């Protein structure tokens, strides 16, 4: 009956996870090769990306770990005894 | 099925591969193997692994347990039976739990051997674990105990350890001449000074140490024993678990272009492992085990024990 | 390839045809 | 008490060293150079001079392969955790818990004294002597055990073992130690053979 | 599911320096049978405990088990078992929290020995709603989901 | 004969067990700005030493048995502290005891292969060289539960010998030659894919910095899958790409390498603009369709979910990125889609 | 009026709860070669009698609150002892209460 | 379906500890009388 | 702890100390193992026609 | 709106890559961050200027 005048603080903690934003037109997983990823094959043009994150300030030098999700695929061919042949391809960030 | 599945010829299951050429940097080492797959054999590389032997030093900052090992039921401010010099007279704060029969200049009589008075062995008797077993305060005229000398640095009882220097568990610094130095100290009633000593305190020098505790309250910065150092209070060290990482992260150089691994044929010598340093092969393997199996389970062979905070410690 | 398959009864215990490749990625 | 013969509460699985199986008194099974020591089923090794232990314990690489293939069909395409329906209660990996500790190296540590239970006085003046009875003694610095950590850690030696309760050491009579059917391929070669074989 | 309490060992508590009832003694050195006072090097006042120290005994695993049964079962008994406190004003409405808080209940009704070795819900506590209880982990979550 | 009641002394046992819980687990793991140096005790100057982290005495009144009574609430002091650098970390608790209990440990380890091309590869017959580079840095090969520098703290490791093992399926020789012949085509090439499937960039955030602008220069974005961003710490992330990092005085959990991410709550919003004018996803999709508001401090219009400050835009995206849940009602996803490193397993709203 | 701090006595609770755990569950279930006979207490001669198994006093220092600190280690004395002959056998603990008390 | 009477014997104790003055100290005696000289 | 072997009451029997008996759970076995004579060929059960 | 720090003389900006067809020109004027609200946000609680 003698409770003080109080104000409410709300927050969330979500450990162990990565903040996934899918590059899909409806934010869903209808397939690994999304529909916006195929819209850019037939467009055949280069676009620049300028992402801008607003974070909580910490009293410490921190890093930002962005996963640009690609298709990091390896195709392995062994045509003869002792012969190993691999072709690598990842798209978009080819190397 | 009988045939066309498993061979009937002399074929091994597991092969052992000695390194062909090993080279060492000050921070890394390199192991070249011959992964020789014989005729008519298939090898899934999931069944391949590196068996590594060695000697790990976890360092002195490894504490695998909360609390302490030694005198955990002691109070944290409880001192050992100690001595100190004030202003130069020596004061004694001790305890005499043992109850004997008679006291002469040779110590305390623990019993007889026929009619000959058998006394206490000053190396380990009387024991600091043996006192009286009844609860009621009976009359104790001939008590005895053990006291650390003034040269022994004063520690609280909580967390104090000295190594035993004989077979019978008695601890005390031996000196060369290899004889122990355990002096006998005879005490009687203050208003009584015939003279009959009531308490015999076997003084000694032990190698006292606090291997897993530290002092949380030092009353005096100065060296030497004092009355103010009875009030020093011992706190256990923080538990530090030093181990290899989950799924052996950090043993294998992934995504280092200067430390890239090789799987190639012996003739063409064209490396099939093209590694790029903006990949995270470790996190690709930590997320792959989650999607294919129950990650809470513990598999010791790949050291598969996932890092997991307690849910009631993070969120109060 | 019914001589490589175990025999549940007298029929070869085969897998499915379309269960040959993998398709899992980090959310896709 | 519990009858492990009937209840299935087997607990002396860790007390096996090796197994040698010979059919017809001369033909050592499995033969065919299958195992790393192919003449016997080495379950555990205390020496381990050649490097044949798994799981950071003393179970061998031959025997852990056989037990993960007898229960789980796991081992030729990588050892991994079996799924929760293959891994039942009386199975292998549900109960296989490998362990390790360090104790004092009495032949290397130059200050070791074998202090028996009659003379170990940790919690000296706060714990009754050799009994759950009332306390007796004085608040005195302990002598047991030797410190394995810290700057004054003793010279230690490592003891490794495993406990795998509730289970039976399955050695399947199959040519690849796997469960490809209840009538195994080595039981069909002896089928319609009319040949008696001694087993030792 | 009353298993009793695992208290085969006694649990003691001790004064803050390990001992408090020490007595004053004086150092005595032998005559060169015979004894004489040694007050030159050592002092004449030395607090030395003769025998075992002072201590008090507590049963911990029974006190934790008796706190468990009172707070969870004996306070949630029907109101026909409880009684009014002495010299304390109380609400006349039995549906008030001030009523339900102040009805003092005997700890001997659900004490640390009730139905020992029996997995037995009380016949007093069968018709009582088990979800009107503070260990209702749903409502314990839903109360904290808004705040304190 | 005692005249009256006996002598006794009262203790509060459950409060003393709960005051020991909150001190040993939460108050000792507070940030070092809340602690102080003890009187008359020689403490080390290096803050990354166990002699520092042990002896920084913390007040019990900071986290005592009355903190946030009836509030399921993690401390704001303890949100930015790594929860996996703790002695209740049951993995590292298990991994410490799997070697033993002593300082001097002779180990015997079997290290798995993780590179995705050669991880599930079924090798055909042939003699192959197989050469690998291994680490020896005690801040990389080892994990402490406090995060102290194990180079200064005397932790050493010495790799005596090494062997490669390989388990072979004893396939029949006229069957393992038919499989060999089939797998040597150009049409039967064993094709693999990294599970993460991402090119990973680390962008630095300065101290007390709120705005973090990144910029990808110019590229064809075909077959692009999405983003997965998380804040790290520069102290806790080693400079990979270099074989030895001399400035890496940390031996705790590395969230960059194991997936133990904990700074997810430190994000306010995300503005993705392709080609400096096209805001993504554009098209009036979201409730604030030009930016991904992850949480709101000041909400007047009422766009929050779950009785927390996470927005209705961002909770929709994260339930659709992981579970395809959000257009036909929000519900608890099943336990097979909801893995350990997933969103809903770990989303813990508090007030 | 009290001058200075009050009177108080100290207990280590989390050790005494852990020392009661190891004695009730492990030290009392040690093999009979470790235990010894109680002083001035009568005891049965048959080792298969509960009156024997109750009264064989065992030292708490065998399994005390410092045994194998930081080691996940079952005792070598306790490996050959049946772990299901234990009062925490949760089946038998349930099968006993299913008939009554 | 078996109906019968089971006798667990005097060596049955389905609980740790005691039922009778459990909070009492183990050395604490009853109010007693004895004989001396 | 019996301080004195003499059964009569004395001053020393104020120091005798009580320990609870060991908990002994006596019950039927799991899945009623032991009630039925299985595999005893002298007590072999019968399911036959009348 | 490109931000300029306090007492900062040089201001580098960069448009990355674009088809510049139908571009008309530039027009620029320095503002103040105190005096310019960040539009798109429905409420700025740190905008203390009227």
Write the element-wise H/E pattern of chain A from the N-terminal end onward: EEHEEEE
What's the total helix number of chain A? 1
Helicity level of chain A, as a percent range? under 10%
Tally the beta strands of chain A: 6
- Helix/strand/pairing category of chain C: mainly beta
Please provide the count of β strands of chain C.
2
Percent strand of chain C equals 5-15%
Main sheet: strands, sense, barrel of chain C: 2 strands, antiparallel
Please characterize this protein's 3D structure.
The structure is cut from a larger assembly and holds nine copies of chain A and one copy of chain C (28 residues). Chain A is mostly beta strands. Chain A has one helix at residues 35-43; strands spanning 11-14, 19-22, 46-55, 62-69, 73-77, 85-89. In chain A, strands 5-6 form a two-stranded antiparallel ribbon. In chain C, strands 1-2 form a two-stranded antiparallel ribbon. The termini of chain C are far apart. At the B-F interface, strand 1, strand 3, strand 4, strand 5 and strand 17 of B face helix 1, helix 2, helix 3, strand 1 and strand 2 of F. Strand 7 (89-96) of chain B pairs parallel with strand 4 (46-50) of chain E.
């Amino acid at each position: 009956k003698t409770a003080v005048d109080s104000i409410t603080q709300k927050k969330f903690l979500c450990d162990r996870t990565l903040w996934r934003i899918p590059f899909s037109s409806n934010f869903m997983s209808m397939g690994a090769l999304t529909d916006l990823g195929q819209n850019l094959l037939y467009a055949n043009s280069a676009h620049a990306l300028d992402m801008t994150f607003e974070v909580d300030p910490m009293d410490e030098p921190t890093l930002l770990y962005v996963l640009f999700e690609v298709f990091d695929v390896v195709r392995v061919h062994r045509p003869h005894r002792g012969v190993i042949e691999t072709v690598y391809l990842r798209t978009p960030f080819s190397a | 099925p009988t045939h066309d599945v498993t061979t009937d010829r002399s074929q091994r299951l597991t092969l052992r591969f000695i390194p062909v050429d090993r080279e060492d940097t000050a921070y890394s080492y390199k192991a070249r193997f011959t992964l020789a797959v014989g005729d008519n054999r298939v090898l899934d590389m999931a069944s391949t692994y590196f068996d590594i032997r060695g000697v790990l030093d976890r360092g002195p900052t490894f504490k695998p347990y909360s609390g302490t090992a030694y005198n955990a039921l002691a109070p944290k401010g409880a001192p050992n039976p100690c001595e100190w010099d004030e202003a130069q007279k020596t004061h004694v704060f001790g305890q005499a739990p043992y109850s004997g029969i008679n006291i002469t200049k040779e110590g305390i009589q623990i019993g007889v051997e026929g009619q000959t008075p058998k006394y206490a062995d000053k190396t380990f008797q009387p024991e600091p674990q043996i006192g009286e077993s009844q609860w009621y305060e009976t009359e104790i005229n001939h008590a005895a105990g053990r006291v650390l000398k003034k040269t022994t640095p004063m520690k609280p009882c909580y967390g104090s350890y000295a190594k035993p220097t004989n077979e019978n568990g008695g601890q005390g610094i031996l000196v060369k001449q290899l004889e122990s130095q355990v002096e006998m100290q005879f005490f009687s009633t203050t208003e009584a000074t015939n003279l009959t000593p009531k308490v015999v305190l076997y003084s000694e020098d032990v190698d006292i140490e606090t291997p897993d505790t530290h002092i949380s309250y030092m009353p005096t910065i100065k060296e030497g024993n004092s009355r103010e150092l009875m009030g020093q209070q011992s706190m256990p060290n923080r538990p530090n678990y030093i181990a290899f990482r989950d799924n052996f992260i950090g043993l294998m150089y992934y995504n280092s272009t200067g430390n890239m691994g090789v799987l190639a044929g012996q003739a063409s010598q064209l490396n099939a492992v093209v590694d790029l340093q903006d990949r995270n092969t470790e996190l690709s393997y930590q997320l792959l085990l989650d999607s294919i199996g129950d990650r809470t389970r513990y598999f010791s062979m790949w050291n598969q024990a996932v890092d997991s905070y307690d849910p009631d410690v993070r969120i109060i | 390839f019914a001589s490589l398959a175990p025999r549940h009864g007298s029929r070869p215990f085969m897998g499915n045809w379309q269960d040959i490749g993998t398709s899992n990625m980090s959310g896709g | 008490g519990s009858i492990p013969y009937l209840d299935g509460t087997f607990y002396l699985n860790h007390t096996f060293k090796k197994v040698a199986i010979t059919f017809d008194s001369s033909v050592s099974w499995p033969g065919n150079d299958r195992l790393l020591t192919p003449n016997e089923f080495e379950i555990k090794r205390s020496v381990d001079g050649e490097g044949y232990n798994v799981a950071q314990c003393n179970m061998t690489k031959d025997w852990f392969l056989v037990q993960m293939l007898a229960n789980y069909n796991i081992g030729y395409q990588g050892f991994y955790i079996p799924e929760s329906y293959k891994d039942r209660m009386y199975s292998f990996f549900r109960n296989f818990q490998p362990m390790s500790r360090q104790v004092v190296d009495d032949t290397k540590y130059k200050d070791y004294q074998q202090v028996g239970i009659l003379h170990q006085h940790n919690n000296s003046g706060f714990v009754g002597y050799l009994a759950p009875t009332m306390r007796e003694g004085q608040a005195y610095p302990a002598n047991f055990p030797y410190p394995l950590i810290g700057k004054t850690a003793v010279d230690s030696i490592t003891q490794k073992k495993f406990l795998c309760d509730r289970t039976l050491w399955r050695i399947p009579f199959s040519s690849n130690f796997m469960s490809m059917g209840a009538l195994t391929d080595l039981g069909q070669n002896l089928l319609y053979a009319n040949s008696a074989h001694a087993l030792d | 599911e009353n298993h009793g309490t695992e208290d085969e060992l006694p649990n003691y508590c001790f004064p803050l320096g390990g001992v408090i009832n020490t007595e004053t003694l004086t150092k005595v050195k032998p005559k060169t049978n015979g004894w004489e006072k040694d007050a030159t090097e050592f002092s004449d006042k030395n607090e030395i405990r003769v025998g075992n120290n002072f201590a008090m005994e507590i049963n911990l695993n029974a006190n934790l088990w008796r706190n468990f049964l009172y707070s969870n079962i004996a306070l949630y008994l029907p109101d026909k078992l409880k009684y009014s406190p002495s010299n304390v004003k109380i609400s006349d409405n039995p549906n008030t929290y001030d009523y339900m808080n102040k009805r003092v209940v005997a700890p001997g009704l659900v004490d640390c020995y009730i139905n020992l070795g029996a997995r037995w819900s009380l016949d007093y506590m069968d018709n009582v709603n088990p979800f009107n209880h503070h260990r209702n982990a749903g409502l314990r979550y839903r109360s904290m989901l808004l705040g304190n | 004969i005692r005249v009256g009641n006996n002598f006794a002394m009262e203790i509060n046992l459950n409060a003393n067990l709960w005051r020991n819980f909150l001190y040993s687990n939460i108050a000792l793991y507070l940030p070092d700005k809340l602690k102080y140096s003890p009187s008359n005790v020689k403490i080390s100057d290096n803050p990354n030493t166990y002699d520092y982290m042990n002896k920084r005495v913390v007040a019990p009144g900071l986290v005592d048995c009355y903190i946030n009574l009836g509030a399921r609430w993690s401390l704001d002091y303890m949100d930015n502290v790594n929860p996996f650098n703790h002695h209740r970390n049951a993995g590292l608790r298990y991994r410490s005891m799997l070697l033993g209990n002593g300082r001097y440990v002779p180990f015997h380890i079997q290290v798995p292969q993780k590179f995705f091309a050669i991880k599930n590869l079924l090798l055909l017959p042939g003699s192959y060289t197989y050469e690998w580079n291994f680490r020896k840095d005690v801040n990389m090969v080892l994990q402490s539960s406090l995060g102290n520098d194990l180079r200064v703290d005397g932790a050493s490791i010495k790799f005596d010998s090494i062997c490669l093992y390989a388990t072979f399926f004893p396939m029949a020789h006229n069957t393992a030659s038919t499989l060999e012949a089939m797998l040597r085509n150009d049409t039967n090439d064993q094709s693999f894919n990294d599970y993460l499937s991402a090119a990973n960039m680390l962008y630095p955030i300065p101290a007390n910095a709120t705005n973090v602008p990144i910029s990808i220069p110019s590229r064809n974005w075909a077959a692009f899958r999405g983003w997965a961003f998380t804040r790290l710490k520069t102290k806790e992330t080693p400079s990979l790409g270099s074989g030895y990092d001399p400035y890496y005085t940390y031996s705790g959990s590395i969230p960059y390498l194991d997936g133990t991410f904990y700074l997810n709550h430190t994000f306010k919003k995300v503005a993705i603009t392709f080609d400096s004018s096209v805001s993504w996803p554009g098209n009036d999709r979201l409730l604030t369709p030009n930016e991904f508001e992850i949480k709101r401090s000041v909400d007047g219009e009422g766009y929050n979910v779950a009785q927390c400050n996470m927005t209705k835009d961002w909770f929709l995206v994260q339930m659709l990125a992981n579970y395809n849940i959000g257009y036909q009602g929000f519900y608890i996803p099943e336990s097979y889609k909801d893995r350990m490193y997933s969103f809903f397993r770990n989303f813990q709203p508090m007030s």
